[PDB]
Amino acid sequence: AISIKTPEDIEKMRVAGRLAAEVLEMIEPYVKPGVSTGELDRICNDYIVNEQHAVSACLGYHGYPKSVCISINEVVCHGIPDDAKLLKDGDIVNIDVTVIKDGFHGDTSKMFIVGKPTIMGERLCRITQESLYLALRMVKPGINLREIGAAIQKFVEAEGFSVVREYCGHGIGQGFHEEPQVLHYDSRETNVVLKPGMTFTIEPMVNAGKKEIRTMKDGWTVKTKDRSLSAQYEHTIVVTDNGCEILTLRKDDTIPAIISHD
Ligand SMILES: c1ccc2[nH]c(-c3cscn3)nc2c1
Ligand SMILES: [Co+2]
Ligand SMILES: [Co+2]
Ligand SMILES: [Co+2]
Ligand SMILES: [Co+2]
Ligand code: NA
């Protein structure tokens, strides 16, 4: 559009964003060696539907068959939960949740390391999260999204890693994937000035190796071409008069929910 949310709209996004975040806090103790991604997905859907009184935006959307996306190791994104896929020590696992409540969407993802961490896994997860946080700290009215993507890329590359090009952040509200596209790297194509009341996600995908990615024969599951590890974190935000408010913050986040400039 780009769609500006009213205060009422924003309050409903606060509620959907909290619910999405709560799914991620809930699922954590279940993420252990020997659990399958299929069970994790069931637990999440059961929780969203029967405790939260909400629904998964994933389920049925363009025919997607499950309720969350679960992406392990070299899978970059859109991993499909499966009863036969079991987690094991050292795995890094992204769970991407999107909840609809009262017509509004809340979208967020985080990494989990399973059992005994490996050093590359810990590092990649930490740097990815730090790249999301740096971008969040830049959001305010007047800024251009190009600057934010540029800053993500500079940081990630300086840390020896690479930024997935083909996937980005997005506006969100009564629609799951709204304008604008929120690129996580510098592009001359990008020119979006932020205004208060915009709501969008930042969701960098970072590869320990080379940025290149291959989609699977299923035209969907995405892996890293060099089979390097890939990590992602995502938050949903609203642009405020002097900053942003994070709508999907968790107790384990180490960034304030409200960021203020001046
Ligand atoms: C579940 C179902 C359909 C989904 N379509 C998206 C998507 C489009 S651009 C970035 N993400 N993600 C999905 C997750
Ligand atoms: Co997606
Ligand atoms: Co998401
Ligand atoms: Co998203
Ligand atoms: Co360490
Ligand atoms: Na991954």
Swiss-Prot record:
<keyword id="KW-0378">Hydrolase</keyword>
<comment type="subunit">
    <text>Monomer.</text>
</comment>
<dbReference type="GO" id="GO:0046872">
    <property type="term" value="F:metal ion binding"/>
</dbReference>
<dbReference type="InterPro" id="IPR002467">
    <property type="entry name" value="Pept_M24A_MAP1"/>
</dbReference>
<feature type="binding site">
    <location>
        <position position="170"/>
    </location>
    <ligand>
        <name>a divalent metal cation 2</name>
    </ligand>
</feature>
<feature type="binding site">
    <location>
        <position position="234"/>
    </location>
    <ligand>
        <name>a divalent metal cation 2</name>
    </ligand>
</feature>
<dbReference type="GO" id="GO:0070006">
    <property type="term" value="F:metalloaminopeptidase activity"/>
</dbReference>
<feature type="binding site">
    <location>
        <position position="234"/>
    </location>
    <ligand>
        <name>a divalent metal cation 1</name>
    </ligand>
</feature>
<keyword id="KW-0031">Aminopeptidase</keyword>
<dbReference type="GO" id="GO:0006508">
    <property type="term" value="P:proteolysis"/>
</dbReference>
<feature type="binding site">
    <location>
        <position position="107"/>
    </location>
    <ligand>
        <name>a divalent metal cation 1</name>
    </ligand>
</feature>
<feature type="binding site">
    <location>
        <position position="107"/>
    </location>
    <ligand>
        <name>a divalent metal cation 2</name>
    </ligand>
</feature>
<protein>
    <recommendedName>
        <fullName>Methionine aminopeptidase</fullName>
        <ecNumber>3.4.11.18</ecNumber>
    </recommendedName>
</protein>
<dbReference type="GO" id="GO:0005829">
    <property type="term" value="C:cytosol"/>
</dbReference>
<dbReference type="GO" id="GO:0004239">
    <property type="term" value="F:initiator methionyl aminopeptidase activity"/>
</dbReference>
<keyword id="KW-0645">Protease</keyword>
<dbReference type="Pfam" id="PF00557">
    <property type="entry name" value="Peptidase_M24"/>
</dbReference>
<feature type="binding site">
    <location>
        <position position="203"/>
    </location>
    <ligand>
        <name>a divalent metal cation 2</name>
    </ligand>
</feature>
<feature type="binding site">
    <location>
        <position position="96"/>
    </location>
    <ligand>
        <name>a divalent metal cation 1</name>
    </ligand>
</feature>
<keyword id="KW-0479">Metal-binding</keyword>
<dbReference type="InterPro" id="IPR000994">
    <property type="entry name" value="Pept_M24"/>
</dbReference>
<feature type="binding site">
    <location>
        <position position="78"/>
    </location>
    <ligand>
        <name>substrate</name>
    </ligand>
</feature>
<comment type="similarity">
    <text>Belongs to the peptidase M24A family. Methionine aminopeptidase type 1 subfamily.</text>
</comment>
<feature type="binding site">
    <location>
        <position position="177"/>
    </location>
    <ligand>
        <name>substrate</name>
    </ligand>
</feature>
<dbReference type="InterPro" id="IPR001714">
    <property type="entry name" value="Pept_M24_MAP"/>
</dbReference>
<dbReference type="InterPro" id="IPR036005">
    <property type="entry name" value="Creatinase/aminopeptidase-like"/>
</dbReference>
<comment type="function">
    <text>Removes the N-terminal methionine from nascent proteins. The N-terminal methionine is often cleaved when the second residue in the primary sequence is small and uncharged (Met-Ala-, Cys, Gly, Pro, Ser, Thr, or Val). Requires deformylation of the N(alpha)-formylated initiator methionine before it can be hydrolyzed.</text>
</comment>
